[PDB]
């Protein structure tokens, strides 16, 4: 299925044109180990996203440890507390992780919608503030 993102090897494969290779701390192996997928755009060519909590990080430096960055920016991500390898998870555990991923993807869309609305509400509020002046 597309439970593929739970597989580290699938995650590593996303970093086809990730620029940070051998010599660096945030190599594709390390990024994939930490739960990241490479999601490059034009404004952000090193954009990476956790497959599980959906936190999006960019502006990577060579010395960045992906695990430490993931912890700093998204300290509650359940993926960070998975100590077993994928194949060692029980089905019950896997299913619970997959439910938690879905809850995470609702906190993410909700969050993006809130942000977008507030951008608009500020502009609107500003305009009406001017009218209320008389």
């Amino acid at each position: 299925p597309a439970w593929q993102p739970f597989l580290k090897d699938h995650r590593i494969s996303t970093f086809k044109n990730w620029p940070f290779l051998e010599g660096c701390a945030c190599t594709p192996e390390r990024m994939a180990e930490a739960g990241f997928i490479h999601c490059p755009t034009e404004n952000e060519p090193d954009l990476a996203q956790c497959f599980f909590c959906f936190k999006e990080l960019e502006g990577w430096e060579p010395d960045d440890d992906p695990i430490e960055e993931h912890k700093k920016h998204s300290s509650g991500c359940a993926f960070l507390s998975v100590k077993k390898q994928f194949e060692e998870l029980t089905l019950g555990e896997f299913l619970k992780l997959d439910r938690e991923r879905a809850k995470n993807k609702i906190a993410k869309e909700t969050n993006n919608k809130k942000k977008e609305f507030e951008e608009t509400a500020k502009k609107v509020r500003r305009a009406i503030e001017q009218l209320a002046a008389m």
Binding site: C26, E44, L47, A48, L57, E58, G59, E61, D64
Partner: peptide, 4 residues
């Protein structure tokens, strides 16, 4: 690294 830093947030979008």
């Amino acid at each position: 690294a830093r947030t979008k």
